[PDB]
């Protein structure tokens with residue numbers, strides 16, 4: 320397939336830019352990582368995760384961040400977002416970032432299963448090595464934001480658990496922060512001009528032809544009727560997928576989702592493009608955005624502690 324070849328060549332271009340950026344970019348200081356843990360009994364290299372920590376721990380456990388990377392469901396691995404994960408860790412958080420098998424080798428159901436396996440691994444083994452699972456920030460960027468938004472709903476719903484073939488994990492998400500998410504991919508082939516066929520191709524690979532996945536491919540289809548944690552929507556008017564952020568706010572309002580936003584206006588400049596705060600941790604706006612996210616997380620964690628007579 321020439322379409323698959325075309326999709327892959329666009330990601331190999333993205334991969335070259337990612338490689339060059341990383342060669343140059345400053346690396347956050349004072350962090351330790353532990354790499355390449357298998358989260359299940361398999362030799363698939365995507366079924367692995369990294370853990371990150373401040374080099375000096377203020378306590379034995381630290382509030383938890385779990386990151387789902389982006390890349391259009393076709394690209395990336397547990398290393399793609401390492402500088403971002405390191406940044407967040409450097410601020411006194413214990414951080415897990417996972418790989419998941421890529422399209423077209425799997426479909427959405429296999430990617431959701433991988434993510435849940437990484438979450439289940441962490442419920443078993445995280446606390447003994449520093450993860451406070453009472454305070455959990457789930458975050459994802461772009462396709463990773465899609466995935467995070469679905470995982471959040473699936474975690475709350477026995478029906479979706481059964482449909483996606485996963486079990487709930489023994490912790491809750493305190494906050495879900497989506498960074499330039501593409502949470503309504505069904506909307507992609509609309510406009511997209513001469514790219515509609517490619518966008519339709521993404522959707523077919525995500526669904527694997529399973530009509531139940533087709534009917535559950537969008538945040539708008541999985542949100543219905545659930546009591547969810549709060550969300551934070553991060554991005555800006557210069558995100559190539561800003562329309563997806565606009566569309567998601569409409570779904571939030573219609574479903575009484577509690578949320579806050581950190582949306583950069585066009586006036587804040589042409590550099591604030593898609594996933595800028597993940598790809599460029601050291602920029603002042605990335606710092607601001609990411610600290611704001613962590614502050615929002617801390618505020619909710621403190622309210623939870625007060626509510627639970629545990630302040």
Ligand SMILES: CCCCCCCC[P@@H](=O)OC[C@@H](COCCCC)OCCCC
Nearest residue numbers: 389390391461462463501514517518521593
């Ligand atoms: C034809 C319609 C395809 C829909 C692609 C969905 C990409 C969302 P995101 O993971 O990636 C964000 C951004 C890339 O951001 C930089 C790399 C992020 C890992 O956009 C990808 C553009 C290539 C098609």
